[PDB]
Amino acid sequence: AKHPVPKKKTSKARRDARRSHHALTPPTLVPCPECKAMKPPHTVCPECGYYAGRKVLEV
Amino acid sequence: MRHLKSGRKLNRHSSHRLALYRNQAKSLLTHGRITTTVPKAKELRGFVDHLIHLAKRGDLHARRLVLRDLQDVKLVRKLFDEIAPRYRDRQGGYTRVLKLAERRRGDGAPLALVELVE
Amino acid sequence: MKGILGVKVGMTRIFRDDRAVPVTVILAGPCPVVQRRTPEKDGYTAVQLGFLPQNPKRVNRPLKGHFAKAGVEPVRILREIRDFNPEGDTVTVEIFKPGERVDVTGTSKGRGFAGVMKRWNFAGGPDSHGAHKIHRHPGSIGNRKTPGRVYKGKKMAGHYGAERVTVMNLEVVDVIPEENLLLVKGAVPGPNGGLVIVRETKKA
Amino acid sequence: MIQPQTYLEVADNTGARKIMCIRVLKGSNAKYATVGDVIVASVKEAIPRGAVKEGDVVKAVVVRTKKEIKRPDGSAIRFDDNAAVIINNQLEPRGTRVFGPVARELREKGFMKIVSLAPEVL
Amino acid sequence: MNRGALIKLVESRYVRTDLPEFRPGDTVRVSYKVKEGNRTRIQDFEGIVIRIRRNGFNTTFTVRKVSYGVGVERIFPLHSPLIQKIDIVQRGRARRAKLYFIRNLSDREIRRKLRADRKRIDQDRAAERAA
RNA sequence: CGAUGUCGGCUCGUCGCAUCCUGGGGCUGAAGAAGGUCCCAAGGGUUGGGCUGUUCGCCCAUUAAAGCGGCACGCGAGCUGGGUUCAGAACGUCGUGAGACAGUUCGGUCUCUAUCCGCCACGGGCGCAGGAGGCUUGAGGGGGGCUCUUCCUAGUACGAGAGGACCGGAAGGGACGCACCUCUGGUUUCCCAGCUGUCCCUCCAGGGGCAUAAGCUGGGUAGCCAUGUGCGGAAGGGAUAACCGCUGAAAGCAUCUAAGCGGGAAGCCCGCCCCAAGAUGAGGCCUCCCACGGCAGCCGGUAAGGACCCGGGAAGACCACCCGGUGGAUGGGCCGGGGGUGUAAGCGCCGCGAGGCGUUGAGCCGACCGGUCCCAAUCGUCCGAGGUCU
RNA sequence: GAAUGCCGGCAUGAGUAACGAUAAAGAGGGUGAGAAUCCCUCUCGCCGUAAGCCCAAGGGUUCCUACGCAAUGGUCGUCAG
RNA sequence: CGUGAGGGAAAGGUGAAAAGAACCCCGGGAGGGGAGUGAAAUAGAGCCUGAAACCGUGGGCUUACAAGCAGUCACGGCCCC
Ligand SMILES: [Mg+2]
Ligand SMILES: [Mg+2]
Ligand SMILES: [Mg+2]
Ligand SMILES: [Mg+2]
Ligand SMILES: [Mg+2]
Ligand SMILES: [Mg+2]
Ligand SMILES: [Mg+2]
Ligand SMILES: [Mg+2]
Ligand SMILES: [Mg+2]
Ligand SMILES: [Mg+2]
Ligand SMILES: [Mg+2]
Ligand SMILES: [Mg+2]
Ligand SMILES: [Mg+2]
Ligand SMILES: [Mg+2]
Ligand SMILES: [Mg+2]
Ligand SMILES: [Mg+2]
Ligand SMILES: [Mg+2]
Ligand SMILES: [Mg+2]
Ligand SMILES: [Mg+2]
Ligand SMILES: [Mg+2]
Ligand SMILES: [Mg+2]
Ligand SMILES: [Mg+2]
Ligand SMILES: [Mg+2]
Ligand SMILES: [Mg+2]
Ligand SMILES: [Mg+2]
Ligand SMILES: [Mg+2]
Ligand SMILES: [Mg+2]
Ligand SMILES: [Mg+2]
Ligand SMILES: [Mg+2]
Ligand SMILES: [Mg+2]
Ligand SMILES: [Mg+2]
Ligand SMILES: [Mg+2]
Ligand SMILES: [Mg+2]
Ligand SMILES: [Mg+2]
Ligand SMILES: [Mg+2]
Ligand SMILES: [Mg+2]
Ligand SMILES: [Mg+2]
Ligand SMILES: [Mg+2]
Ligand SMILES: [Mg+2]
Ligand SMILES: [Mg+2]
Ligand SMILES: [Mg+2]
Ligand SMILES: [Mg+2]
Ligand SMILES: [Mg+2]
Ligand SMILES: [Mg+2]
Ligand SMILES: [Mg+2]
Ligand SMILES: [Mg+2]
Ligand SMILES: [Mg+2]
Ligand SMILES: [Mg+2]
Ligand SMILES: [Mg+2]
Ligand SMILES: [Mg+2]
Ligand SMILES: [Mg+2]
Ligand SMILES: [Mg+2]
Ligand SMILES: [Mg+2]
Ligand SMILES: [Mg+2]
Ligand SMILES: [Mg+2]
Ligand SMILES: [Mg+2]
Ligand SMILES: [Mg+2]
Ligand SMILES: [Mg+2]
Ligand SMILES: [Mg+2]
Ligand SMILES: [Mg+2]
Ligand SMILES: [Mg+2]
Ligand SMILES: [Mg+2]
Ligand SMILES: [Mg+2]
Ligand SMILES: [Mg+2]
Ligand SMILES: [Mg+2]
Ligand SMILES: [Mg+2]
Ligand SMILES: [Mg+2]
Ligand SMILES: [Mg+2]
Ligand SMILES: [Mg+2]
Ligand SMILES: [Mg+2]
Ligand SMILES: [Mg+2]
Ligand SMILES: [Mg+2]
Ligand SMILES: [Mg+2]
Ligand SMILES: [Mg+2]
Ligand SMILES: [Mg+2]
Ligand SMILES: [Mg+2]
Ligand SMILES: [Mg+2]
Ligand SMILES: [Mg+2]
Ligand SMILES: [Mg+2]
Ligand SMILES: [Mg+2]
Ligand SMILES: [Mg+2]
Ligand SMILES: [Mg+2]
Ligand SMILES: [Mg+2]
Ligand SMILES: [Mg+2]
Ligand SMILES: [Mg+2]
Ligand SMILES: [Mg+2]
Ligand SMILES: [Mg+2]
Ligand SMILES: [Mg+2]
Ligand SMILES: [Mg+2]
Ligand SMILES: [Mg+2]
Ligand SMILES: [Mg+2]
Ligand SMILES: [Mg+2]
Ligand SMILES: [Mg+2]
Ligand SMILES: [Mg+2]
Ligand SMILES: [Mg+2]
Ligand SMILES: [Mg+2]
Ligand SMILES: [Mg+2]
Ligand SMILES: [Mg+2]
Ligand SMILES: [Mg+2]
Ligand SMILES: [Mg+2]
Ligand SMILES: [Mg+2]
Ligand SMILES: [Mg+2]
Ligand SMILES: [Mg+2]
Ligand SMILES: [Mg+2]
Ligand SMILES: [Mg+2]
Ligand SMILES: [Mg+2]
Ligand SMILES: [Mg+2]
Ligand SMILES: [Mg+2]
Ligand SMILES: [Mg+2]
Ligand SMILES: [Mg+2]
Ligand SMILES: [Mg+2]
Ligand SMILES: [Mg+2]
Ligand SMILES: [Mg+2]
Ligand SMILES: [Mg+2]
Ligand SMILES: [Mg+2]
Ligand SMILES: [Mg+2]
Ligand SMILES: [Mg+2]
Ligand SMILES: [Mg+2]
Ligand SMILES: [Mg+2]
Ligand SMILES: [Mg+2]
Ligand SMILES: [Mg+2]
Ligand SMILES: [Mg+2]
Ligand SMILES: [Mg+2]
Ligand SMILES: [Mg+2]
Ligand SMILES: [Mg+2]
Ligand SMILES: [Mg+2]
Ligand SMILES: [Mg+2]
Ligand SMILES: [Mg+2]
Ligand SMILES: [Mg+2]
Ligand SMILES: [Mg+2]
Ligand SMILES: [Mg+2]
Ligand SMILES: [Mg+2]
Ligand SMILES: [Mg+2]
Ligand SMILES: [Mg+2]
Ligand SMILES: [Mg+2]
Ligand SMILES: [Mg+2]
Ligand SMILES: [Mg+2]
Ligand SMILES: [Mg+2]
Ligand SMILES: [Mg+2]
Ligand SMILES: [Mg+2]
Ligand SMILES: [Mg+2]
Ligand SMILES: [Mg+2]
Ligand SMILES: [Mg+2]
Ligand SMILES: [Mg+2]
Ligand SMILES: [Mg+2]
Ligand SMILES: [Mg+2]
Ligand SMILES: [Mg+2]
Ligand SMILES: [Mg+2]
Ligand SMILES: [Mg+2]
Ligand SMILES: [Mg+2]
Ligand SMILES: [Mg+2]
Ligand SMILES: [Mg+2]
Ligand SMILES: [Mg+2]
Ligand SMILES: [Mg+2]
Ligand SMILES: [Mg+2]
Ligand SMILES: [Mg+2]
Ligand SMILES: [Mg+2]
Ligand SMILES: [Mg+2]
Ligand SMILES: [Mg+2]
Ligand SMILES: [Mg+2]
Ligand SMILES: [Mg+2]
Ligand SMILES: [Mg+2]
Ligand SMILES: [Mg+2]
Ligand SMILES: [Mg+2]
Ligand SMILES: [Mg+2]
Ligand SMILES: [Mg+2]
Ligand SMILES: [Mg+2]
Ligand SMILES: [Mg+2]
Ligand SMILES: [Mg+2]
Ligand SMILES: [Mg+2]
Ligand SMILES: [Mg+2]
Ligand SMILES: [Mg+2]
Ligand SMILES: [Mg+2]
Ligand SMILES: [Mg+2]
Ligand SMILES: [Mg+2]
Ligand SMILES: [Mg+2]
Ligand SMILES: [Mg+2]
Ligand SMILES: [Mg+2]
Ligand SMILES: [Mg+2]
Ligand SMILES: [Mg+2]
Ligand SMILES: [Mg+2]
Ligand SMILES: [Mg+2]
Ligand SMILES: [Mg+2]
Ligand SMILES: [Mg+2]
Ligand SMILES: [Mg+2]
Ligand SMILES: [Mg+2]
Ligand SMILES: [Mg+2]
Ligand SMILES: [Mg+2]
Ligand SMILES: [Mg+2]
Ligand SMILES: [Mg+2]
Ligand SMILES: [Mg+2]
Ligand SMILES: [Mg+2]
Ligand SMILES: [Mg+2]
Ligand SMILES: [Mg+2]
Ligand SMILES: [Mg+2]
Ligand SMILES: [Mg+2]
Ligand SMILES: [Mg+2]
Ligand SMILES: [Mg+2]
Ligand SMILES: [Mg+2]
Ligand SMILES: [Mg+2]
Ligand SMILES: [Mg+2]
Ligand SMILES: [Mg+2]
Ligand SMILES: [Mg+2]
Ligand SMILES: [Mg+2]
Ligand SMILES: [Mg+2]
Ligand SMILES: [Mg+2]
Ligand SMILES: [Mg+2]
Ligand SMILES: [Mg+2]
Ligand SMILES: [Mg+2]
Ligand SMILES: [Mg+2]
Ligand SMILES: [Mg+2]
Ligand SMILES: [Mg+2]
Ligand SMILES: [Mg+2]
Ligand SMILES: [Mg+2]
Ligand SMILES: [Mg+2]
Ligand SMILES: [Mg+2]
Ligand SMILES: [Mg+2]
Ligand SMILES: [Mg+2]
Ligand SMILES: [Mg+2]
Ligand SMILES: [Mg+2]
Ligand SMILES: [Mg+2]
Ligand SMILES: [Mg+2]
Ligand SMILES: [Mg+2]
Ligand SMILES: [Mg+2]
Ligand SMILES: [Mg+2]
Ligand SMILES: [Mg+2]
Ligand SMILES: [Mg+2]
Ligand SMILES: [Mg+2]
Ligand SMILES: [Mg+2]
Ligand SMILES: [Mg+2]
Ligand SMILES: [Mg+2]
Ligand SMILES: [Mg+2]
Ligand SMILES: [Zn+2]
């Protein structure tokens, strides 16, 4: 190879346009049916340790 | 292509991956429940379930087969005397994986519990 | 034209006049007529076939109304056969008889991101004599200042397969109506389990 | 499955012992010769005082191959060597006897005399 | 649906059951139907079976023999209609499924390596004492 | 000249036509067969070797043919580095010498990261006046386009003979292309077995690690594959080229042409296969939802639907696509079958012993074809029409 | 306003290459505001003419213990030259 | 920095006065919010003034059929005085 290099500085517009797909998407959260805490679905609740309606975990 | 290929690789060569499964089995069979990454948890099910099933058969041959992976005679003895008889009527499904809510801080890894079923 | 929708089940071979005959087995019918395309209504002629029954608890409301207007139970797949107006309300393997030739359309197996050697049978590069990290590379992709660009349609690495492919003029070796089974001599695109379309051949 | 550079045993009594295919006589650019195909070959080894000698450029028909031959009945046949019989421009054998078995494909390709001269046809 | 059962169903018209069970290392005589012009005859191929390649109806087996100084191998579909009959000429006992290694052995070394399978030879004698 | 890397090769093509072959023709000092010469024709095709850095060329063996040129003597941010083209060394030769030679000879550092255009693939956004779930039309693109032999007609027409057709018909090939894995043949990183050395468990027996990122060796399912299997080039229609005509004046004859009509190419248009409505010219059909509250606008709750999350997938870099989510067989286990390996351990018996025989096609056993709710897809959340105007 | 000018500041490339031998990890327990990364136990792997031990150069407090984590450590850090 | 001869930097400013922010609140701390001091605290010690490049939050106009040395001339739409 022969060391490719940028030909022109990237403009503010083109830099920020490239970044138009970078925004985070918020985390998916459901209420825990036992303690009403907001938590990812399909995880053992980190606030009360219940899952599938029963205590799985000391928290 | 990976078409219809079975079994994770876990970025380990042959002997390391086999030693990973053996070591996790000893740990799970010892404590009843462990925490790993979700991918490791899922692959550990089939490995342990097979050892538990051979324990249920109970013969000398089964014990010698199990010993190839577990090596600890006192632990195989625990597997045959205590662990296996509480699964006499259970046909498969001797382990369960439940995903944990919080990721590991240093690398974001999703975690899961693996345990023996009641 | 005449056609039917099907599932590719697998390959084997039968013996016919002391010859081994490679066959692909297709589970073709039966296919209810769910809609007819007419020149007055739709501007052309074809029959929308249905295939494989579905759990209604999975069929949403606009689809349910479409089946109900046809008086047909909920089906997994709708596909049209162009220029085909079957007389009955159901197309089965019996539209084909042994000795006929058919065109079979499937979705080919997917190579994913394929190199230029798998996709286009490029020769690649030498594996010794100083060859330097270009063993599977395409080589040159053009000229110089004229034209100073790369042609459209240049053959390059990229996704390969999982596309519609039609193999033409296949011999129907047997029909087993009791099991809605079609035996076609030769190879048919896609995996076992894949949806295929079997049409009367366009080759004379 | 024979191509230029391939060595073949000589299944006849022409005097030649080893020939080296230099051409597959099967069109513009055939890649391989099988049983029943004709090759041009150089004679690389011959016994003293035979009809053919070393350095002769001869034609021969491939009579058996190490690459197994497929048949429409679903079966196949495979020999331990790559063997040829040296022929003239009329496809006739130049020797008077052929050694070892020969493929039955030869018969269908018009080498009747070689088929009969053989001890076994498989 | 059961795609495997459907395939087995298509093959069912062609499966045969008249042929005798054999193992790699056995010596076998295959009576095989052959065309030649302007007739069709039965040619016997007799040799050691060095491979049984199993796939249900698509099982095939390979028989090796030396003919007139040259080794020959034939692959036969185990359910070919062109097989008239198979005769067990000798039971050999091997220690492995594939006997490719005998392609490199002298005939003496083969006789040493594939000795007669007494257990199965007696089994063939006991049977065939039919009523 | 604050650098436009320079021969040849390899790879990858694409174009011109002054055409090497294949298709169509006129003339022939064209009997036939085979040639010669010119015209039309660029759709496809145009082999493998020996020599030399070679381009070129010669030679060998074939071929329908082994075409000639352009693209920075196409292509070194694609590779090579034989040549050429620094520093070393030598020969011939020139020069008193230092040194010199498109003369020769041996050797001699070819730079991981692509910003923009371009190209190959894949998404996200918004649009397509109501919002949705399907199924589609095909404007316009692309892909493909090759050819040989044998046989019949017929040893006929033609020819003294040798030789040997048109037209029409049949079979078999080569290379190339697409797909596939039943068969043939590969691989198959742990599916099975055998083996050595060493260390260990537990002394025997039985096993485990390591000897590679499989210690070695003999095998090997699914998958992915070619060497294996199927299928393709068309047919057919339309308009033409060169060329050949019909009728026919100007020009009482003649003339394919000035009016008019016909025949006629592997080439052109269509036909086949694939993409395709961002075709903003945003298409069509079937079906579903509805005119909801508060102030071509806004605010919130809903509708048909959809997304999230999860189990996964011959789908896949992410994404996307597809299937499933307890009203469930989606993965995992377990069971049966297939498949591989090829007779486990233990015990009995024979041998002083290494071992052997029996139990036993046993034991082990990935992916393949299925079964089974044992394990896990719990529980849920958030979006989403109220239909501008003539 | 330019001198491939000088000094300084701050951009672009870009959330990109990389994070320095492919000897390799797993779990449980503890500490802590915080743990893949610190301590402890068990399992696994690697070196063993060394990747173990002693000495001479050179280096110059890096040694031991307590307390601590802003910076240094290619991540993290409760640990540490 | 260099074995050495030798080379050789950068770096000034709270306020009149430390009156240098007790005490409370979130935080492990860092940092901040109140309180308080001061004529002044975007004079709070990373301190006079505090330009420019460069980065960000809010608002007005505008932009997803479009060909561009990016301006200029014209007209029209919207927003503001
Ligand atoms: Mg390079
Ligand atoms: Mg380069
Ligand atoms: Mg580069
Ligand atoms: Mg390089
Ligand atoms: Mg670079
Ligand atoms: Mg540049
Ligand atoms: Mg901006
Ligand atoms: Mg950009
Ligand atoms: Mg708490
Ligand atoms: Mg794929
Ligand atoms: Mg791979
Ligand atoms: Mg799976
Ligand atoms: Mg996998
Ligand atoms: Mg594995
Ligand atoms: Mg791996
Ligand atoms: Mg990794
Ligand atoms: Mg690792
Ligand atoms: Mg290892
Ligand atoms: Mg190893
Ligand atoms: Mg996954
Ligand atoms: Mg879970
Ligand atoms: Mg999570
Ligand atoms: Mg951490
Ligand atoms: Mg399809
Ligand atoms: Mg490639
Ligand atoms: Mg390839
Ligand atoms: Mg391809
Ligand atoms: Mg190549
Ligand atoms: Mg290659
Ligand atoms: Mg090479
Ligand atoms: Mg190199
Ligand atoms: Mg290099
Ligand atoms: Mg290399
Ligand atoms: Mg390249
Ligand atoms: Mg240009
Ligand atoms: Mg795709
Ligand atoms: Mg039949
Ligand atoms: Mg398949
Ligand atoms: Mg000589
Ligand atoms: Mg011989
Ligand atoms: Mg099958
Ligand atoms: Mg069935
Ligand atoms: Mg015979
Ligand atoms: Mg024999
Ligand atoms: Mg018969
Ligand atoms: Mg210059
Ligand atoms: Mg410059
Ligand atoms: Mg310049
Ligand atoms: Mg330069
Ligand atoms: Mg060219
Ligand atoms: Mg011309
Ligand atoms: Mg020509
Ligand atoms: Mg011609
Ligand atoms: Mg003539
Ligand atoms: Mg003549
Ligand atoms: Mg002519
Ligand atoms: Mg002419
Ligand atoms: Mg002319
Ligand atoms: Mg052409
Ligand atoms: Mg062209
Ligand atoms: Mg050309
Ligand atoms: Mg050549
Ligand atoms: Mg050479
Ligand atoms: Mg040579
Ligand atoms: Mg050469
Ligand atoms: Mg040359
Ligand atoms: Mg020359
Ligand atoms: Mg010459
Ligand atoms: Mg010729
Ligand atoms: Mg010719
Ligand atoms: Mg040129
Ligand atoms: Mg140039
Ligand atoms: Mg020139
Ligand atoms: Mg020149
Ligand atoms: Mg050039
Ligand atoms: Mg050239
Ligand atoms: Mg070049
Ligand atoms: Mg280069
Ligand atoms: Mg070059
Ligand atoms: Mg270049
Ligand atoms: Mg360059
Ligand atoms: Mg380049
Ligand atoms: Mg360049
Ligand atoms: Mg050189
Ligand atoms: Mg040289
Ligand atoms: Mg030279
Ligand atoms: Mg020189
Ligand atoms: Mg120099
Ligand atoms: Mg030099
Ligand atoms: Mg010299
Ligand atoms: Mg001299
Ligand atoms: Mg001179
Ligand atoms: Mg001179
Ligand atoms: Mg002189
Ligand atoms: Mg002199
Ligand atoms: Mg000079
Ligand atoms: Mg010189
Ligand atoms: Mg020169
Ligand atoms: Mg010179
Ligand atoms: Mg010289
Ligand atoms: Mg050298
Ligand atoms: Mg040189
Ligand atoms: Mg560089
Ligand atoms: Mg980079
Ligand atoms: Mg780029
Ligand atoms: Mg540009
Ligand atoms: Mg889109
Ligand atoms: Mg989108
Ligand atoms: Mg329409
Ligand atoms: Mg079109
Ligand atoms: Mg367009
Ligand atoms: Mg076209
Ligand atoms: Mg005749
Ligand atoms: Mg005559
Ligand atoms: Mg003809
Ligand atoms: Mg053909
Ligand atoms: Mg298979
Ligand atoms: Mg295979
Ligand atoms: Mg097979
Ligand atoms: Mg095989
Ligand atoms: Mg194993
Ligand atoms: Mg050992
Ligand atoms: Mg010991
Ligand atoms: Mg011990
Ligand atoms: Mg022992
Ligand atoms: Mg060890
Ligand atoms: Mg190792
Ligand atoms: Mg091993
Ligand atoms: Mg060995
Ligand atoms: Mg093998
Ligand atoms: Mg192996
Ligand atoms: Mg396989
Ligand atoms: Mg092939
Ligand atoms: Mg016409
Ligand atoms: Mg006149
Ligand atoms: Mg006239
Ligand atoms: Mg006219
Ligand atoms: Mg006409
Ligand atoms: Mg005409
Ligand atoms: Mg005419
Ligand atoms: Mg035509
Ligand atoms: Mg053609
Ligand atoms: Mg389409
Ligand atoms: Mg549309
Ligand atoms: Mg469409
Ligand atoms: Mg347009
Ligand atoms: Mg539409
Ligand atoms: Mg809903
Ligand atoms: Mg996935
Ligand atoms: Mg992602
Ligand atoms: Mg869908
Ligand atoms: Mg769904
Ligand atoms: Mg649900
Ligand atoms: Mg439910
Ligand atoms: Mg399931
Ligand atoms: Mg299952
Ligand atoms: Mg199973
Ligand atoms: Mg079985
Ligand atoms: Mg079996
Ligand atoms: Mg035994
Ligand atoms: Mg035993
Ligand atoms: Mg004894
Ligand atoms: Mg005994
Ligand atoms: Mg089984
Ligand atoms: Mg299993
Ligand atoms: Mg359940
Ligand atoms: Mg059920
Ligand atoms: Mg919930
Ligand atoms: Mg100036
Ligand atoms: Mg500069
Ligand atoms: Mg500069
Ligand atoms: Mg400067
Ligand atoms: Mg300046
Ligand atoms: Mg400066
Ligand atoms: Mg600067
Ligand atoms: Mg920057
Ligand atoms: Mg910078
Ligand atoms: Mg990224
Ligand atoms: Mg980049
Ligand atoms: Mg990257
Ligand atoms: Mg670095
Ligand atoms: Mg990286
Ligand atoms: Mg590195
Ligand atoms: Mg590293
Ligand atoms: Mg811990
Ligand atoms: Mg802990
Ligand atoms: Mg830590
Ligand atoms: Mg921490
Ligand atoms: Mg520790
Ligand atoms: Mg070691
Ligand atoms: Mg030692
Ligand atoms: Mg000292
Ligand atoms: Mg120091
Ligand atoms: Mg000390
Ligand atoms: Mg200290
Ligand atoms: Mg210390
Ligand atoms: Mg401490
Ligand atoms: Mg620190
Ligand atoms: Mg820190
Ligand atoms: Mg910190
Ligand atoms: Mg401090
Ligand atoms: Mg640091
Ligand atoms: Mg740090
Ligand atoms: Mg570092
Ligand atoms: Mg602390
Ligand atoms: Mg430290
Ligand atoms: Mg110095
Ligand atoms: Mg110093
Ligand atoms: Mg100095
Ligand atoms: Mg200063
Ligand atoms: Mg002061
Ligand atoms: Mg002051
Ligand atoms: Mg405080
Ligand atoms: Mg605090
Ligand atoms: Mg606090
Ligand atoms: Mg403070
Ligand atoms: Mg605060
Ligand atoms: Mg404060
Ligand atoms: Mg105050
Ligand atoms: Mg004042
Ligand atoms: Mg101020
Ligand atoms: Mg101030
Ligand atoms: Mg002042
Ligand atoms: Mg200030
Ligand atoms: Mg400031
Ligand atoms: Mg500023
Ligand atoms: Mg800015
Ligand atoms: Mg803004
Ligand atoms: Mg437009
Ligand atoms: Mg617009
Ligand atoms: Mg303007
Ligand atoms: Mg105006
Ligand atoms: Zn909870």
From Swiss-Prot, chain A:
The gene is rpmF. Residues 1-29 are annotated as: Disordered. GO terms for molecular function: structural constituent of ribosome. Gene3D superfamilies: Single helix bin. InterPro entries: Ribosomal_bL32, Ribosomal_bL32_bact, Ribosomal_zn-bd. This is Large ribosomal subunit protein bL32. SUPFAM superfamilies: Zn-binding ribosomal proteins. Residues 1-22 have a biased composition (Basic residues). Part of the 50S ribosomal subunit. Belongs to the bacterial ribosomal protein bL32 family. One of its GO terms (biological process) is translation. Found on the solvent side of the large subunit. The lineage of its organism: Bacteria, Thermotogati, Deinococcota, Deinococci, Thermales. The keyword Ribosomal protein applies. Transmembrane segments: none annotated. NCBIfam families: rpmF_bact. Keywords: Ribonucleoprotein, Ribosomal protein.
Swiss-Prot record, chain B:
GO terms for cellular component: cytosolic large ribosomal subunit. GO terms for biological process: translation. Pfam families: Ribosomal_L17. Keywords: Ribonucleoprotein, Ribosomal protein. SUPFAM superfamilies: Prokaryotic ribosomal protein L17. The keyword Ribonucleoprotein applies. Gene3D superfamilies: Ribosomal protein L17. One of its GO terms (molecular function) is structural constituent of ribosome. InterPro entries: Ribosomal_bL17 (IPR000456), Ribosomal_bL17_sf (IPR036373). Belongs to the bacterial ribosomal protein bL17 family. Part of the 50S ribosomal subunit. Contacts protein L32. This is Large ribosomal subunit protein bL17.
Swiss-Prot record, chain D:
The keyword Secreted does not apply. The keyword Endoplasmic reticulum does not apply. This is Large ribosomal subunit protein uL14. SUPFAM superfamilies: Ribosomal protein L14. PANTHER family: 50S/60S RIBOSOMAL PROTEIN L14/L23, LARGE RIBOSOMAL SUBUNIT PROTEIN UL14M. GO terms for biological process: translation. Belongs to the universal ribosomal protein uL14 family. It comes from Thermus thermophilus (strain ATCC 27634 / DSM 579 / HB8). InterPro entries: Ribosomal_uL14, Ribosomal_uL14_bac-type, Ribosomal_uL14_CS, Ribosomal_uL14_sf. Pfam families: Ribosomal_L14 (PF00238). One of its GO terms (molecular function) is large ribosomal subunit rRNA binding. Part of the 50S ribosomal subunit. Contacts protein L19. Forms a bridge to the 30S subunit in the 70S ribosome, contacting the 16S rRNA.
From Swiss-Prot, chain E:
Pfam families: Ribosomal_L19. Transmembrane segments: none annotated. It comes from the Bacteria. It comes from Thermus thermophilus (strain ATCC 27634 / DSM 579 / HB8). HAMAP family: Ribosomal_bL19. Contacts the 16S rRNA of the 30S subunit (part of bridge B6), connecting the 2 subunits. This is Large ribosomal subunit protein bL19. Part of the 50S risobomal subunit. Contacts protein L14. Forms a bridge to the 30S subunit in the 70S ribosome, contacting the 16S rRNA. Keywords: Ribonucleoprotein, Ribosomal protein, RNA-binding, rRNA-binding. GO terms for biological process: translation. The keyword Metal-binding does not apply. PROSITE patterns: RIBOSOMAL_L19. The keyword RNA-binding applies. GO terms for cellular component: cytosolic large ribosomal subunit. NCBIfam families: rplS_bact. Belongs to the bacterial ribosomal protein bL19 family.
